[PDB]
Amino acid sequence: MTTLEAFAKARSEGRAALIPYLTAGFPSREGFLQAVEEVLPYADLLEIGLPYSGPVIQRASELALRKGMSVQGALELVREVRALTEKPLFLMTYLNPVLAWGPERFFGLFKQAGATGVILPDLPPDEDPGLVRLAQEIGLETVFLLAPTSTDARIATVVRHATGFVYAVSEVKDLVRRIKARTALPVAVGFGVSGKATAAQAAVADGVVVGSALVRALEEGRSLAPLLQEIRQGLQRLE
Ligand SMILES: O=P(O)(O)OCCCc1c[nH]c2ccccc12
């Protein structure tokens, strides 16, 4: 289903959507695919990170690159994941590799590989609307980030360019409230959720990203379901 439908389904079920984040090729190519199999049952949508040169996420990118991850490698993995699910798949990437390959080619390749959209953490959309438009015209939803320091004007500016959803990073209820005042777009948040309690604090958002917690689980060689189940139980809105 579409990104909006994935978020809507979660909301209707009275819960914040669970969005696993997995670094492409971490801890290995096979390990990554196995991880995808384990998180999909819990995922409303999935984020796949393109490793490029937070401490935990940094460790994962570092190991992935040391093992040979590349844009071509990430492309094949996106195809592999698309073969396993019809759920929304978002590629998170810094601008550097996009510029190296050329925006039109980079975005075109990932859209063709099966990506639903891209998350561009280091691109203020208002600074290059043309680049944003290009990705959108190619068929990719474009997610941009907002920090707690964002003024009303900054929030308004970013939500004007975002599609799919808006990503708020680091209290959570306050930031979510302020963003919803300027948009009907789903709002996902990421602040190191690691269990039921921290997930409950984030339950107010339309979606909650889980990245660092999964890196740790993978490093420790633990099954992922127990962790995701605790988080899912915390994402469920109660009386
Ligand atoms: O919030 P955590 O610890 O679950 O990480 C979620 C991973 C999303 C993520 C990966 N790399 C980033 C760079 C900037 C902002 C967010 C990210």
DSSP per residue over the chain, as a string? --HHHHHHHHHHTTBPEEEEEEETTSS-HHHHHHHHHHHTTT-SSEEEE-----HHHHHHHHHHHHTT--HHHHHHHHHHHHTT--S-EEEE--HHHHHHH-HHHHHHHHHHHT--EEE-TT--GGG-HHHHHHHHHHT-EEE-EE-TT--HHHHHHHHTT--S-EEEE---HHHHHHHHTT--S-EEEES---SHHHHHHHTTSSEEEE-HHHHHHHHTT--SHHHHHHHHHHHB---
Rounded Cα–Cα distance for residues 195 and 229 (Å): 9
CB atoms within 10 A of CB 193: 27
- Catalytic choice (47, 76, 137, 171): 47
In the block, residue with structure tokens 């199999």? 37
Residue 81 structural domain: 1-239
Whole-number Å distance between alpha carbons of 167 and 2:
17
Q: What spacing in Å lies between the alpha carbon of 211 and ligand 1's midpoint?
A: 6
CATH number of the domain within which 160 lies: 3.20.20.70
Ligand 1 pocket test target in 18, 19, 21 with most atoms within 8 Å of CB: 21
User: What was the elucidation method?
Assistant: X-ray
The resolution, in angstroms to one decimal, equals 1.7
Nearest CA to ligand 1 atom 6: 211
What is the domain count for the chain?
1
Pick from 48, 3, 5, 55: which is nearest to 24 by CA? 48
Query: Among residues 137, 152, 141, which one has the least CA distance to residue 188?
Result: 141
Q: Is 190 in the pocket of ligand 1 (CB under 6 A)?
A: yes
